[PDB]
């Protein structure tokens, strides 16, 4: 068991272009990501059964584009649950997601894979956390057979009760104790929870395996409150060489299964291409 | 008719010291605010029927302290509801809170007074917004007879679907069209939703009636990401002369119902006096 190769590469989140993964939606997102000049598309596998693999393989080939995958779990698939029937549903979704990612020749399963994405009605018990750590052990081991790293995305208090800072994320990963399990940081969530935009990156070092770039309000990069200068300087200091996906959500493009959960009440952009294009330039200028 | 006098004065949120307003909790919080050097205490009126008003007035006299009030409504008192019985409950609580604030000699009712504080399942309908605007018209007119201004606190996407930016708040206040209705900004909520920390303040000018100071993670002022230098520069430029309350919420002090609502999963402070004391020094040094 070991970590699978990572490279400095730039990706666009599928929801920048498409709210579904129909033949049309898949192509819109892949074509968009390719058009803006990204190395990969990040597919939202919130329902990995809805994904036509052959179709997707063909599109990625057609546009000379690589794929990674992210998801959140839901109440019905929450691996922190003290109901083992719900944890089993979680393990199953995570296996299927991995199977799909393997069929597409992808190497990264990231996002909120360790709990239900959304507002918890109270703080996590030690048992909620232990349930989550075990589930990520079973996932990392399943993934390892298929040349896939998992990257646990730290998100803000409103989207998980398990880990809200990189430091918390790192301590969680110590317990997972798997070589193909990494920290996933997102500048949007960091903007809320972190003591500056450097502390968690510098602590993480080689354990930082994935990055999401989002503005404070998840709109155009450079129109919000995120100190990107301080963040990217930290990446340079640890010489980060892994996926970097631009992520943004507008009511304009809505997945029913994500948009209400992320409380995307506001339209912060309408031109996917203009947003994605400016974002990659903004990112590449700094890293 | 008219708006009531505002002065530049510094406030401590009662919830920094006490989770309740028992005689002991009230005494503790008022003595705390006075000890830290604040001009007033901001009393949480989530349940204004549970306040002993004569006791509170005696305490405020005893410690030579003024009082303003903030609250959030809940599902059962949501003035945005399409259930007129629920709106009626909201009107009733808002009237009661105004009565309490009036008897206490206060002039400012602020916070999430226009909707239920928390995660909405979907975006706000035209009805939801119109119901809210009408409720704030009835409240503003009721408060006008009692020399009280109302200030509508703009909160982040996870805490309301009605208004997430200062600009949205100003537009909502245009429809309310009451001289004693003002905008209320909170740096914690601005840190997520705003295009920088100056814009909403410069646009609001004389319509900014109330300010909450919160760090990005709601911990010690200056250990987070909020560009306070840029915010206070904006306050200076419009010569803001209104209440400035420091707030933060510890799961060790507040009611489990509120800490769960605000997703306080960790505590970045334990010493109420040290936090509140240092918070005021931080504020008074910049404004
Ligand atoms: O930031 C996120 C949600 O706020 C993550 O990117 C999600 O886990 C991922 O996009 C799943 O949609
Ligand atoms: O920022 C706030 C909520 O997060 C407001 O201060 C509260 O809604 C209000 O003070 C009630 O406690
Ligand atoms: Mn993300
Ligand atoms: Mn506030």
Residue numbers in the entry:
A (entry chain A), B (entry chain B): 0 to 286
Text taken from the publication that reported this structure:
Here, we report the isolation of a novel protein from Methylomonas sp. expected to be a putative enzyme based on sequence similarity to ketose 3‐epimerase. The synthesized gene encoding the deduced ketose 3‐epimerase was expressed as a recombinant enzyme in Escherichia coli, and it exhibited the highest enzymatic activity toward l‐ribulose, followed by d‐ribulose and d‐allulose. The X‐ray structure analysis of l‐ribulose 3‐epimerase from Methylomonas sp. (MetLRE) revealed a homodimeric enzyme, the first reported structure of dimeric l‐ribulose 3‐epimerase.
